[PDB]
Amino acid sequence: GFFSFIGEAFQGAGDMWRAYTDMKEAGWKDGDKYFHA
Amino acid sequence: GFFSFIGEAFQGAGDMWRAYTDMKEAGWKDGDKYFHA
Amino acid sequence: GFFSFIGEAFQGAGDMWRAYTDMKEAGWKDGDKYFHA
Amino acid sequence: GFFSFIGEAFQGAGDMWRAYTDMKEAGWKDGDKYFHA
Amino acid sequence: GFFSFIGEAFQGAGDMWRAYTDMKEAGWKDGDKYFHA
Amino acid sequence: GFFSFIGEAFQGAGDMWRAYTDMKEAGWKDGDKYFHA
Amino acid sequence: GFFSFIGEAFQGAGDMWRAYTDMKEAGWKDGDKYFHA
Amino acid sequence: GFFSFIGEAFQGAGDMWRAYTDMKEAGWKDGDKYFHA
Amino acid sequence: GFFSFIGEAFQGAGDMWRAYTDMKEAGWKDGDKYFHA
Amino acid sequence: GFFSFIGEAFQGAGDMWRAYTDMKEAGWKDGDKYFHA
Amino acid sequence: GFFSFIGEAFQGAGDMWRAYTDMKEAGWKDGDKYFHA
Amino acid sequence: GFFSFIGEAFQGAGDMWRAYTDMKEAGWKDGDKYFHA
């Protein structure tokens, strides 16, 4: 894949550029994400 | 794939540029996402 | 695929540029998303 | 595919540019999405 | 496919530019979407 | 296909630019959509 | 697309089931094909 | 796409089931193909 | 894509099930193919 | 992609199940292929 | 990608299941392939 | 990727299950391959 980003990126809560690869018989659990202003 | 982004990107809560690949017999669970202003 | 974006992108709660690929015997669960203003 | 976007994009709750590809014997579940103003 | 968009796009709750491709023996479930103003 | 859009697009609840392609033995379910003003 | 072939297919010289997809700013050149009997 | 082939396929010289995908600023050159009997 | 082949496939000289994907600023050159009987 | 092959496959000279992926500023050269009987 | 092969595969000279991936500023050269019977 | 092979595979001269990955500023050269019977 190809991606070109120019400028600003904002994230309050969470993940950025996560790459999970080549898994077998795996499990996981992600929590909740909250944003308050 | 090809993507070109110029400018600003805003996310309050969640994931950006997530890439899950090559999985077998996998499982997972993502939580809830909240935004308040 | 090809995509060209120029300007601003806003997301209160959720995912952006998610790419799930090459899965076998997989499962998952995404939560709810809330926006309040 | 080809897409050209110029200007602003707004999303209160949900996903943007989701790409699910090459799946076999897969399952998942997405939650509800709420918008309040 | 080819698409050219110039201007503003607004979504209260839901998905934008979703691309599901190359699936076999798959299943999923999307939730409800609410808009209040 | 070819599409040219100039101006504004508004959606209260639902999907925009959804592209489902190359499916075999698939199933899914979409929820209800509500708009209140 | 959908195709169902039952029987024999013969080709002396050339390509079969060629699929070129999603190209931008591309070029190529194919040669000549000869058949003698 | 969908294809179902039952029987025999013969090729003297060339390619079968070629799939070129997602290219940008690419170039190539294929040679000649000869068949003699 | 989907393909189902049942039976025999013969190739004297060349490629089978070639898959070139996700290229940028690439070049190559293929040679000639000869068949004699 | 999906492919199902049942039976025999014969190749005198060349490649089978070649997969080139994710290349940038690349070059190469393939030779000639000969078949004699 | 997904592939299912049942039966026999014969190659006189060349490569099988070649996978080149994630290259930048690369070059190479493959030789000729001969088959005699 | 996913591959399932059941049966026999024959190669006279060449490579099988070659996997080249994550290269930068690389070069190489492969020789010729001959088959005689």
DSSP string, D1-37: -EEEEEEEEEEEES-BS-EEEEEES-EEE---EEEE-
The pairing of beta strand D33-36 with beta strand E33-36: parallel
Nearest chain D Cα distance for residue F29, angstroms:
10
CA distances to H23, I28, J28 from H28, in Å: 11, 5, 10
Q: Do A23 and B26 touch, CB atoms closer than 8 A?
A: yes
- Joined together, the tokens standing for residue A17 give 């550029």
Q: Do B9 and A8 touch, CB atoms closer than 8 A?
A: yes
**Nearest Cα to Cα of residue I37 among F13, D30, J35:** J35
CA distances to E15, J21, K29, L37 from I29, in Å: 43, 17, 10, 29
| Cross-chain residue pair D34–C37, CB shorter than 8 Å | no
Distance CA G25, CA B16 (A): 29
Three-state DSSP at G1 gives coil
**Nearest Cα to Cα of residue F6 among D4, E16, E15:** D4
Distance CA J24, CA J26 (A): 5
DSSP 8-state secondary structure symbol assigned to residue H16:
B
Q: For K1, which residue in chain D has the nearest alpha carbon?
A: D22
How many of the other CB atoms lie within 10 Å of CB of G8?
Answer: 11
| J·K CB contacts under 8 A | 122
Residues of H in contact with B1 (CB under 8 A): 22
Measured at the CA of G9, the angle between CA G5 and CA G12, to 5 degrees, comes to: 150
Measure CB to CB from residue H9 to each of G3, G15, G16 and give the nearest one. Answer: G16
The pairing of beta strand I33-36 with beta strand H2-13: unpaired
- Joined together, the tokens standing for residue L9 give 């595979």
State which amino acid sits at residue H23: M
**Nearest Cα to Cα of residue K27 among C37, C19, A16, L29:** L29
Distance CA H20, CA H18 (A): 7
Nearest chain E Cα distance for residue C33, angstroms:
9
Distance CA I19, CA H23 (A): 12
F and B make contact (3+ CB pairs below 8 Å): no
Q: Which long-range contacts (CB under 8 A, 24 or more apart) does A6-11 make?
A: A6/B5, A6/B6, A6/B7, A7/B5, A7/B6, A7/B7, A7/B8, A7/B9, A8/B8, A8/B9, A9/B8, A9/B9, A9/B16, A10/B8, A10/B9, A10/B10, A10/B11, A11/B11, A11/B14, A11/B16
CA atoms within 13 A on the CB side of F25: 9
Q: Which residues, including other chains, have CB under 8 Å from residue G22's CB and lie 6 or more apart?
A: C1, C2, D1, H21, H22, H23
Measured in Å, how far apart are chain J's first and last C-alpha atoms? 35
Name the β-bridge partners of K19. J19, L19
Measure CB to CB from residue C31 to each of A3, A32, A35 and give the nearest one. Answer: A32
Distance CA H31, CA C20 (A): 38
Nearest chain J Cα distance for residue H4, angstroms:
10
How many of the other CB atoms lie within 10 Å of CB of B28?
Answer: 19
A and G make contact (3+ CB pairs below 8 Å): no
- Joined together, the tokens standing for residue G24 give 């931008």
Residues of I in contact with J31 (CB under 8 A): 31
Measured at the CA of A10, the angle between CA A6 and CA A21, to 5 degrees, comes to: 80
J and H make contact (3+ CB pairs below 8 Å): yes
Measure CB to CB from residue L37 to each of K2, K24, K37 and give the nearest one. Answer: K37
Name the β-bridge partners of K24. J24, L24
Q: Can you list the positions of beta strands (E) in chain J?
A: 2-13, 19-24, 27-29, 33-36
Residues of D in contact with E37 (CB under 8 A): 37
Three-state DSSP at C14 gives coil
- Joined together, the tokens standing for residue J30 give 């393939």
| Cross-chain residue pair D17–E17, CB shorter than 8 Å | yes
Nearest chain K Cα distance for residue I29, angstroms:
10
Tell which I residues from 8 to 27 touch K, by Cβ distance under 8 Å: 12-13, 17, 19
Partners of chain K (3+ Cβ pairs below 8 A): D, I, J, L
Q: Which residues, including other chains, have CB under 8 Å from residue K25's CB and lie 6 or more apart?
A: J24, J25, J26, L24, L25, L26
The residue to which tokens 């579940």 are assigned: D29
Indicate the resolution in Å. Answer: 2.7
| Cross-chain residue pair A1–C17, CB shorter than 8 Å | no
Residues of F in contact with E12 (CB under 8 A): 11-13
User: Exposed, middle or buried, D1 (CB in 10 Å: 0-12/13-18/19+)?
Assistant: middle
